[PDB]
Structure formats: C-alpha cells, structure tokens
Amino acid sequence: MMRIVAADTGGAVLDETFEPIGLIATVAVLVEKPYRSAKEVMVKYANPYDYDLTGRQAIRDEVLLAIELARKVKPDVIHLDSTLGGIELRKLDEPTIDALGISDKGKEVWKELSKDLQPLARKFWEETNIEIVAIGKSSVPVRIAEIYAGIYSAKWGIENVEKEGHLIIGLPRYMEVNIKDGKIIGRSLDPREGGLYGSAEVSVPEGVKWEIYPNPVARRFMIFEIFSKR
DNA sequence: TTTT
Ligand SMILES: [Mg+2]
Ligand SMILES: [Mg+2]
Numbered sequence A: 001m002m003r004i005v006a007a008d009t010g011g012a013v014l015d016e017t018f019e020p021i022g023l024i025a026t027v028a029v030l031v032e033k034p035y036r037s038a039k040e041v042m043v044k045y046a047n048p049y050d051y052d053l054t055g056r057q058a059i060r061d062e063v064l065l066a067i068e069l070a071r072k073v074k075p076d077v078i079h080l081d082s083t084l085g086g087i088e089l090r091k092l093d094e095p096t097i098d099a100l101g102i103s104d105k106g107k108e109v110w111k112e113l114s115k116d117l118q119p120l121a122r123k124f125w126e127e128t129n130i131e132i133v134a135i136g137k138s139s140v141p142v143r144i145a146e147i148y149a150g151i152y153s154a155k156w157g158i159e160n161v162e163k164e165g166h167l168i169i170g171l172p173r174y175m176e177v178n179i180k181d182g183k184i185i186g187r188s189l190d191p192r193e194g195g196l197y198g199s200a201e202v203s204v205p206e207g208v209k210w211e212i213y214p215n216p217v218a219r220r221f222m223i224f225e226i227f228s229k230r
Numbered sequence B: 001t002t003t004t
Helices: A056-073 A094-098 A104-128 A140-158
Strands: A004-009 A012-014 A020-023 A025-031 A040-045 A077-080 A132-134 A166-170 A175-180 A183-188 A197-201 A209-214 A222-227
Touching: A004 A056, A004 A140, A025 A056, A025 A140, A040 A056, A040 A140, A056 A077, A056 A104, A056 A132, A077 A140, A094 A104, A104 A132, A140 A166, A140 A175, A140 A183, A140 A197, A140 A209, A140 A222, A175 A209, A175 A222
Parallel strands: A004 A077, A077 A132
Antiparallel strands: A004 A025, A012 A020, A012 A166, A025 A040, A166 A222, A175 A183, A183 A197, A209 A222
C-alpha cells in the first residue's frame, strides 16, 4: 500500500536550567505498512551549539532531507511536520499562509520559509508527482521520524560526551531510549500510538554512564543525561 | 510554525 517519507528534527542539548540550547538530529524515514517503524533512514547532525530555535532551520532541514530520501526511494507522498491541516507545500504561497488559522508569528516564520521551500516543493512535484503535505501531529511517519531523531540524539550524546564531560539532552515528547549490546532502541511512551519504535547501532565508550528522568521544566519530556568516563 |  501507501509508502511515506517523513522528516523531523529533534535532539536538544540543554543547559543546567534544562532550557534548550540547540537541536541535534534531522532524520528522514521511509515508512511502509504496518507503519510502526522505518524501512530506511537518513540522518543529518546539526551543531546544537549555534542553532536557530525559532523553527526556520529545523523545518528547512526537514524538507531538504526528506526530498533527498524521497527522490531516491520514490514514496507516494512526503509528510512534513507542521500541523496546517494537510495542505501541500507546493501550494503554500504567502497569501495562502496569511489566510491560515495560525499565530501571527507562525505566519511570519512560514512566509519566510515559503520563499524558498514553496518553489522547492513545486519543482519536486512537477518531476515526480510527489506532494509534500503539512500534516504535522496527525502523521504516524512524522512521529516515527521524531522517535528516530531521539534515537540519533542519544547516539550523538554517547559519541560526544568525551569532548564535553557532561551532557544534558532533552528527548522528543514522551519517548525513551534503551541501550543494550551496542544498539539504541527508542520507543514511544504513548500507548495510544500503537507501539512505534526504531533503532540505531551505537558504540559506547567504557566508563560512560547515562540516566533517563523527567525534565522538570517540560512536562511529558525526558532527560537523557550522560556522564563522561570518569 | 517549529524546539524542549
Ligand atoms: Mg518537527
Ligand atoms: Mg518532532
């Protein structure tokens, strides 16, 4: 049946205040029936130190990665993580945005992303028939991409806790990570979603420990705290 | 809008 590509951006390095500093991973996934996991993945790491948190960088990074993965694997459709009711990105011009039911800042950021992303969605559509749709939180593949973003942020944490000495990572909404036998398994904590999961291989440098607990300043989000081999 |  329907094969979908989706992207999301989702690691977050935090300060001792538990407040975000920057995002870590952008991940595009290919999802087939039965839509609990990813057949294929593309990961692009950002620099969480010096990241734009207003949304412009994350959404732009998502569309470019997903289009890359989509051109290769040819899904039926791409799912973009922005809850705009499913309108196609190739149709998201400025007046179509100004007529949306969203916050003035929402319109301000999208219209600015529109300038370059909307023609980019149109070009890709003219040559593949593949829509990019702003479905956001009601898409299962987007949630899978989010879970993979979490997974690869754990992986990024583990492999960069040496440069740093301590690392505080905010995972995406209600998900956990487990690491056993050299691989990260991420799972949604939401039973309502139907058992979504992913995994990535990791190489854990001996001596490095980690711990998962709630973020006190962001209910429903978990902290992945990792201590350097000391 | 999106991030946690
Ligand atoms: Mg997102
Ligand atoms: Mg997300």
